[PDB]
Design a protein around this ligand. Structure first.
Ligand code: NA
Ligand code: NA
Ligand SMILES: [Zn+2]
Ligand SMILES: [Zn+2]
Ligand SMILES: [Zn+2]
Ligand SMILES: [Zn+2]
Lengths: 159, 159
């Protein structure tokens, strides 16, 4: 509403061009999703609702927020879906229930994979957009393994 | 089991290198998934179960099998996730509840997008692997629109 501020904050925030992080309350925020030009919601949860907005695709990454969970195997295909939506001109929103561990880990992976950032730089960007972003320590280890794989693959430099 | 045949058929079939189509009974077929080297299940449903197999990622594409449903917007990011899993060496299984409309449409999209096949050739390949494959007519129209977009993008030839 062209006012006047919005009392409640938006349920997401911009991390980088065409990339947003948020929480599951975004699912129902149809008008905000359309206004931001989001075309893909990456729902990193097993049971959180998805969007029902016109022109907005959902991809669900059904992982528990647990250090023993295998986020790693999901990272490469998830990041590829994200990049394809981005290169086709849409924006991507990555959310989980509370916008903390799972969505942070996925956004961090994407920034390393497709924006050329080291793990530390990528996580700093997520943290700046959303201070409560905090991948669990199991996911942090998996992100380090992904980073090393990216280096071996010449996607990231050793530096 | 090295026998002796398998009484019940496998819940999927090979469409092309690194690409399988099947139904939701595949979700629980842990040993068959591992044996086929499947690393990504694309679950094209809202409520069908996913795999719980080690080293197997799931991506859910939560669309109803209805001609009015917007499969189209999901196609590009879904196919990109599939190609990334494939290029990293895994095989991809695309399933829906009954292995008919939704999974057929997604496999057909992938073959056009990443294997250079026209819509007709791509669908013939799916049909050959799984005769009951049959995208609903709404999805067929969306696939035609995707094909035209791919042509405009120089991904497919006009021929
Ligand atoms: Na660590
Ligand atoms: Na048609
Ligand atoms: Zn829950
Ligand atoms: Zn939970
Ligand atoms: Zn159902
Ligand atoms: Zn249903």
């Amino acid at each position: 509403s062209l006012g006047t501020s919005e009392a409640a904050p938006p349920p997401f925030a911009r991390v980088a061009p065409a990339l947003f992080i948020g929480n599951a309350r975004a699912a129902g925020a149809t008008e905000l999703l359309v206004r931001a030009g989001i075309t893909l919601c990456v729902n990193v949860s097993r049971q959180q609702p998805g969007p029902r907005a016109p022109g907005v695709a959902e991809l669900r990454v059904p992982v528990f927020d647990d250090p023993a969970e295998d986020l790693l195997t999901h990272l490469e295909p998830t990041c590829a879906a994200m990049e394809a939506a981005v290169r086709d001109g849409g924006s991507c929103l990555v959310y989980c229930k509370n916008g903390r561990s799972r969505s942070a880990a996925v956004c961090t992976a994407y920034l390393m994979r497709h924006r050329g950032h080291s793990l530390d730089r990528a996580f700093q960007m997520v943290k700046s957009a959303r201070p409560v972003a905090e991948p669990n320590l199991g996911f942090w280890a998996q992100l380090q393994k992904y980073e090393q794989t990216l280096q071996a693959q010449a996607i990231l430099p050793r530096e």
